[PDB]
From a paper:
The human [name] gene encodes a 37 kDa protein of 330 amino acids that, based on similarities to other proteins, is predicted to have an N-terminal immunophilin-like domain and a C-terminal tetratricopeptide repeat ([name]) domain.
The structures show that the C-terminal carboxylate group and the C-terminal aspartate ([name]) or glutamate (TOMM20) side-chain are involved in a series of hydrogen bonds that is reminiscent of the carboxylate clamp seen in the MEEVD-HOP complex. In the [name]-EDASRMEEVD ([name]) structure the C-terminal carboxylic acid makes direct hydrogen bonds to one of the ring nitrogens of His 183 and to the amine nitrogen of Asn 187 and Asn 236. The C-terminal aspartic acid side-chain carboxyl-group also forms a direct interaction with the amine group of Lys 266. The valine side-chain is itself packed into a hydrophobic pocket formed by the side chains of Asn 187, Tyr 190, Arg 191 and Asn 236. The side-chain hydroxyl of Tyr 190 forms a direct interaction with the main-chain carbonyl of the second glutamate in the [name] peptide.
Residue numbers in the entry:
A (entry chain D): 1 to 7
B (entry chain A): 172 to 315
The structure:
Amino acid sequence: SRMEEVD
Amino acid sequence: AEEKAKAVPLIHQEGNRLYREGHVKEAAAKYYDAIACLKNLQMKEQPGSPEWIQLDQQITPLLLNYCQCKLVVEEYYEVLDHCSSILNKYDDNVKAYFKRGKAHAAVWNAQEAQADFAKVLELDPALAPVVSRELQALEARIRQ
């Protein structure tokens, strides 16, 4: 999903 | 040296929760450990075999998580290398191009940054707003 999110 | 394939998902989970809480230096440590565990198992497999490939694919998201921590703490040299390694095998990995683009920008490789952000857009046009922000920033700095 979001670029800053892990996984 | 094999009964810790079971540890990996737990370490992974603890890393993720640390990251979300803002404990990013410590999440990095967790991801690093999970990765070391997977690599050791992978060392026991023949490269290119199904088991080797499965382990490699389990490492990828963990290695990207680690790179994300490194972006936050402003250390770009591992991000460049780790992302390049992922991308040399899996050249459709959107997060890898994106993180590598950010790291390139941070260390003033404008051309290389633009190339990676371009690739992100080719693979996922839905990312135009975030990519445009990164590129806007970059472009301003190119303007001097």
